[PDB]
A paper describes a structure:
Pull-down and yeast two-hybrid analysis demonstrate an interaction with the N-terminal region of the M. oryzae dynein intermediate chain (DIC) MoDyn1I2 as observed for other dynlt1/3 proteins confirming MGG_01005 as the dynlt1/3 of M. oryzae.
The 1.9 Å structure of the MGG_01005 was solved by single-wavelength anomalous diffraction (SAD). There is one protein molecule in the asymmetric unit (ASU) and the final refined model contains all residues except those between 80 and 112 that are not visible in the electron density map and are likely to be flexible or disordered. In addition, electron density for three extra residues (HHS) from the N-terminal His-tag is present. The monomer structure consists of two α helices (A to B) and 4 β-strands (β1-4). Three β-strands (β1-β3-β4) comprise an antiparallel β-sheet. The fourth strand β2, packs against the equivalent sheet (β1′-β3′-β4′) of a symmetry related molecule to form a dimer comprising an 8 stranded β-sandwich structure where each monomer has the topological arrangement αA-αB-β1-(β2′)-β3-β4, Fig. 1B. The configuration of this strand-swapped dimer and the magnitude of buried surface area: 1654 Å2 comprising 154 atoms from 43 residues in each molecule and a homodimer interface stabilized by 36 hydrogen bonds and 2 salt bridges suggests strongly that MGG_01005 is homodimeric in solution. This observation was confirmed by gel filtration chromatography and sedimentation velocity analytical ultracentrifugation measurements that demonstrate the dimer mass in solution.
Numbering used by the authors:
A (entry chain A), B (entry chain A): -2 to 79, 113 to 153
């Protein structure tokens, strides 16, 4: 994946985002030995709720006099192993808005990858 | 794909979004007989730029006294045929913000699908 659009700094340090996403994916599918189409919905739901709860919490201003300053969208995709190329463009505020993507690579026996993308939008 | 989050009406009628996306995909990969990893970047770039240009244009207020009211993000993914499940959650304004997704199904010989997602964010 690669962004076509210029962008602002993440309200959350990208090393923390990486940890949030890696932990979310691990909690959801870490013990899974195979891709199971019957569980992908449950898996994706758990990943997204985990990440969203974490980024909402940690993007909050320390003081009550300042309300949440960022909207977030979080997408999670589970892809069964085979060829995949993704791109993102935007019409937004290049000083403040942006995206970050994460790939949770499954090993040989896993038979699936998890790709996560987070968008933040100021105000 | 399915959204986990409640949402507002599209600033552009969804039948028009469907046409924009279908035409963009057709223009980019309509004449392609096979999946080619060496062309996916060019294909995705064309699709996204086409869609973005169209949605920017048609979301503009008719009057100059009112500036653009929506930010947009557009993601395009080209997937080689094999198992794929996607989900989206959000922390946004449920009265005004939302997402829309489109799948351009490739026939047997095509060997690839195109999935498009558009997010709109008020103000």
């Amino acid at each position: 994946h690669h962004s076509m659009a210029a962008q602002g700094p993440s309200p959350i340090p990208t090393n923390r985002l990486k940890q949030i996403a890696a932990d979310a994916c691990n909690d959801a599918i870490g013990s899974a030995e195979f891709y199971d189409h019957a569980k992908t919905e449950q898996w994706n739901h758990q990943i997204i709720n985990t990440i969203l709860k974490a980024v909402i919490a940690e993007s909050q201003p320390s003081d009550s006099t300042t309300p949440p300053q960022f909207k977030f969208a979080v997408n999670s995709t589970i892809v069964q192993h085979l060829g995949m190329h993704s791109a993102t463009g935007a019409f937004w505020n290049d000083k403040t808005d942006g995206m970050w993507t994460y790939k949770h690579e499954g090993d040989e026996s896993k038979g699936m990858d998890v790709v996560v993308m987070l968008i933040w939008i100021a105000v």
